[PDB]
Amino acid sequence: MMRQKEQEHMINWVEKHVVQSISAQQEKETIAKCIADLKLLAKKA
Amino acid sequence: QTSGGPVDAGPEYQQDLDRELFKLKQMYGKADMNTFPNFTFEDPKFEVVEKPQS
Amino acid sequence: VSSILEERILGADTSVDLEETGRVLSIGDGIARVHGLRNVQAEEMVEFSSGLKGMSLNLEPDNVGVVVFGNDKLIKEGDIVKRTGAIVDVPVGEELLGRVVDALGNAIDGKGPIGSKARRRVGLKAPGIIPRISVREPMQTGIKAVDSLVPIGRGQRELIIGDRQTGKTSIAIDTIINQKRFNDGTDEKKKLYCIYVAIGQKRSTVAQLVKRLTDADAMKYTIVVSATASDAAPLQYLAPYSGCSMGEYFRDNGKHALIIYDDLSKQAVAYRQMSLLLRRPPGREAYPGDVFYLHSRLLERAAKMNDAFGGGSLTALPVIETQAGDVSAYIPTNVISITDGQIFLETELFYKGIRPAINVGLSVSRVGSAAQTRAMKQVAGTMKLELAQYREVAAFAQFGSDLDAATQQLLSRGVRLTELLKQGQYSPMAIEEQVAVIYAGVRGYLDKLEPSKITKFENAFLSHVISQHQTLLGKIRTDGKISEEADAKLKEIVTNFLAGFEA
Amino acid sequence: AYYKANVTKAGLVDDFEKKFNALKVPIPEDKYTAQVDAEEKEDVKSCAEFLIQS
Numbered sequence A: 001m002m003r004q005k006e007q008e009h010m011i012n013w014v015e016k017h018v019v020q021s022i023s024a025q026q027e028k029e030t031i032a033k034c035i036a037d038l039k040l041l042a043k044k045a
Numbered sequence B: 001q002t003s004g005g006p007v008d009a010g011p012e013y014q015q016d017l018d019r020e021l022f023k024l025k026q027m028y029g030k031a032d033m034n035t036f037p038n039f040t041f042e043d044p045k046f047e048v049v050e051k052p053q054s
Numbered sequence C: 001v002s003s004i005l006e007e008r009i010l011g012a013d014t015s016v017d018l019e020e021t022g023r024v025l026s027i028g029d030g031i032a033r034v035h036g037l038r039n040v041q042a043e044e045m046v047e048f049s050s051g052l053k054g055m056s057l058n059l060e061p062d063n064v065g066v067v068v069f070g071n072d073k074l075i076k077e078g079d080i081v082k083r084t085g086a087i088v089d090v091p092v093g094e095e096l097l098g099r100v101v102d103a104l105g106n107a108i109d110g111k112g113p114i115g116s117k118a119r120r121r122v123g124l125k126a127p128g129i130i131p132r133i134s135v136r137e138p139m140q141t142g143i144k145a146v147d148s149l150v151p152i153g154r155g156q157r158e159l160i161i162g163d164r165q166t167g168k169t170s171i172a173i174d175t176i177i178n179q180k181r182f183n184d185g186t187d188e189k190k191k192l193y194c195i196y197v198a199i200g201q202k203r204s205t206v207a208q209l210v211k212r213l214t215d216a217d218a219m220k221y222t223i224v225v226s227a228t229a230s231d232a233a234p235l236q237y238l239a240p241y242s243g244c245s246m247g248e249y250f251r252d253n254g255k256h257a258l259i260i261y262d263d264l265s266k267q268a269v270a271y272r273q274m275s276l277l278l279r280r281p282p283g284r285e286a287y288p289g290d291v292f293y294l295h296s297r298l299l300e301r302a303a304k305m306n307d308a309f310g311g312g313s314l315t316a317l318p319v320i321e322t323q324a325g326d327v328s329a330y331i332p333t334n335v336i337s338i339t340d341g342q343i344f345l346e347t348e349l350f351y352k353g354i355r356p357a358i359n360v361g362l363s364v365s366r367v368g369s370a371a372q373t374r375a376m377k378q379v380a381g382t383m384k385l386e387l388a389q390y391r392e393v394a395a396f397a398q399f400g401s402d403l404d405a406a407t408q409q410l411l412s413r414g415v416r417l418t419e420l421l422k423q424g425q426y427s428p429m430a431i432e433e434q435v436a437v438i439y440a441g442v443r444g445y446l447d448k449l450e451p452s453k454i455t456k457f458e459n460a461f462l463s464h465v466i467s468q469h470q471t472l473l474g475k476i477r478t479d480g481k482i483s484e485e486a487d488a489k490l491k492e493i494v495t496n497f498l499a500g501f502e503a
Numbered sequence D: 001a002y003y004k005a006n007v008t009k010a011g012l013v014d015d016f017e018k019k020f021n022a023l024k025v026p027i028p029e030d031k032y033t034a035q036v037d038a039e040e041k042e043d044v045k046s047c048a049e050f051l052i053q054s
């Protein structure tokens, strides 16, 4: 039960911190990777 | 890297720990976490059958 | 911590790919008309964007009726619905043993993830007339009444029909608790892997059921599959097909398996909810047409396999309740019609005093003496014929029509065998003690012995035979037939015990 | 080994191993077999004088 509740606390804080950071992260390499992915699906399509 | 205790826990963390630990105290009794006891030494005492005469 | 880190970041591929979707129309009550999936195949697992599966039925030119696997708050109008790409499937292994598994594959019991290896399609086609062979093995339940009047075959389906609160789940758990002594033994042919599909029950009944099986040390045959009341109607619909697919895995590998479908009428009523929400026309008692086809697939997934196909068997026993004993209702007539073996409990014998409350002549096993041991066949056919004679003579001589010596003989032997067939809850006995006690009941030696004293006769007789007659019971159960020296020895031991019983 | 690998509490597993595997308790005594055998011998002697009288 110790490792269970510490695991739950850990996983929820990880998800909350991910929301906190990536909600305020824009540097257009997201969109660059996404257009690269459309390009890759174009080459394989 | 944020070791030295569970991170940013708050009091209800330890409250849930205490309720779960309290139910776990209910599931065995009031024993100790070390130096276990063995038993209480009982004595089987079967009464002697007797007879006046056969 | 670090192992959790690396399994999280290596396990999910995040391999994005172009994929068929479609937006959602009316998300009514677990049903969702989905517009767009022009290449979806019928009865396919599909996936709502909040992380929840649904099953696509009722493909129409307008839209597809996907019926959801769970809660309905998590779905709006206008969200995507991604095709998974395959029919709904159940992860099956032998590491799934002894673990409560939520109806798809999802082990909701708090003992880690399932170590499955063999995924299996759940809507598979049952074997034909050539891969099947007939019942051969004696599926014993430990109940004296079942194993002496309606015996089960490894290779067979046999109902447990009654009314509510009669002992049907208790008969199923007697059947489960008997087979421990065959699992921990030597022969693989005796060993048991059973699947208890609890449909539409409550979670605390399944929890106390797992408590009884763990306290009885049942968790190596057993696979408990709970689709409880709070689960969605397709989880209750699809759960016995999952247990059938796990049983088919064990059967086609060649291990003797069984499935207890507890509260199979709950599958019928969940599929009634599904059809009436997907706007199919209602038939009788508002159940649709193909409820018989539903249970017919589900129950003809089981018979003995051919000797060239592994030799594994399946024993389907579904539990069904009537209401006010009305056998003529739609679901009991359908499920009696598909099955062949059926155990009838009427309930007035439960309040009258026999336990388990098989009220009897309605109950029949069509495989009959073929699914008994040779000893029980040599002993308990005249018992069934005598009980038939006893029932009809008591039925017309309720008031004392004519009492010669023959009629009081019939009522005496009938009442004494009636108190033979009483048996306590959660106490199954092996076949050899059953042969011994029905030998002590049918072959004389109990006919004039005061019918209230039969239960103490049972207790002291089983104590006697387990006390100094273990090797003779080994001779009976391993030799098969009860031999003539063992026959006269049982005669002598029951005579000696009649003396020690009138001592 | 399994309970030492599972229980990470240091000292406790070897402590319980030492206090359990070197734990011995005696059989609960009788002090009645001598009475039973002496009463056996007395009823055999009375049965022997009954024997010679018969």
Ligand SMILES: Nc1ncnc2c1ncn2[C@@H]1O[C@H](COP(=O)(O)OP(=O)(O)O)[C@@H](O)[C@H]1O
Binding pocket: C163, C164, C165, C166, C167, C168, C169, C170, C171, C321, C355, C356, C357, C423, C424, C425, C426
């Ligand atoms: N052999 C038996 N001896 C005593 N009681 C029994 C026996 N078999 C069943 N019962 C009774 O049946 C009841 C359980 O019925 P159950 O199988 O749960 O029916 P349902 O599943 O329809 O509710 C218990 O209360 C138990 O006392």
Ligand SMILES: [Mg+2]
Binding pocket: C168, C169, C262, C263, C319
């Ligand atoms: Mg039940």
